[PDB]
């Protein structure tokens, strides 16, 4: 059984998103999201079309780069380290699931190193 998809809304918004969330969604996300392997990241896991009935027993905070997506638009975040630890939840959370060899791995392995340079450039918070 799958649990609903992570909230993307926030009842308290920042009053405007900072330079460096705006990088992280116009630049960082933009870029994840059109790499040949982000598609299996793309939404939530769904352990049921999986047969994964474990997935939740060991993932507690299921993440996903369409979650972040709608997070980054609907101004969710009050500042970069909140939506830097999603994308970390979400790499880990495949790390922590499957095993060092898995196909799925060396994907989200790829994906990480191009968010690691990606969050280089990330601007000094303004």
Same mark, same amino acid.
């Given at each position: 059984?799958?649990?609903?998809?992570?909230? +993307?809304?926030?009842?308290? /918004?920042?009053?405007?998103?900072?330079?460096?969330?705006?990088?992280?969604?116009?630049?960082?996300?933009?870029?994840?999201?059109?790499?040949?392997? =982000?598609?299996?990241?793309?939404?939530?896991?769904?352990?049921?079309?999986?047969?994964?009935?474990?997935?939740?027993?060991?993932?507690?905070?299921?993440?996903?780069?369409?979650?972040? /997506? /709608?997070?980054?638009?609907?101004?969710?975040?009050?500042? =970069?380290?909140?939506?830097?630890?999603?994308?970390? +939840?979400?790499?880990?959370?495949?790390?922590?699931?499957?095993?060092?060899?898995?196909?799925?791995?060396?994907?989200?392995? =790829?994906?990480?190193?191009?968010?690691?340079?990606?969050?280089?450039?990330?601007?000094?918070?303004?």
């Amino acid at each position: 059984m799958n649990p609903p998809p992570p909230e +993307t809304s926030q009842p308290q /918004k920042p009053k405007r998103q900072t330079n460096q969330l705006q990088y992280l969604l116009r630049v960082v996300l933009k870029t994840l999201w059109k790499h040949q392997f =982000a598609w299996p990241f793309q939404q939530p896991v769904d352990a049921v079309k999986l047969n994964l009935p474990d997935y939740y027993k060991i993932i507690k905070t299921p993440m996903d780069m369409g979650t972040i /997506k /709608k997070r980054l638009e609907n101004n969710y975040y009050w500042n =970069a380290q909140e939506c830097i630890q999603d994308f970390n +939840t979400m790499f880990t959370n495949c790390y922590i699931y499957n095993k060092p060899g898995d196909d799925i791995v060396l994907m989200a392995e =790829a994906l990480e190193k191009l968010f690691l340079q990606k969050i280089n450039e990330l601007p000094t918070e303004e």
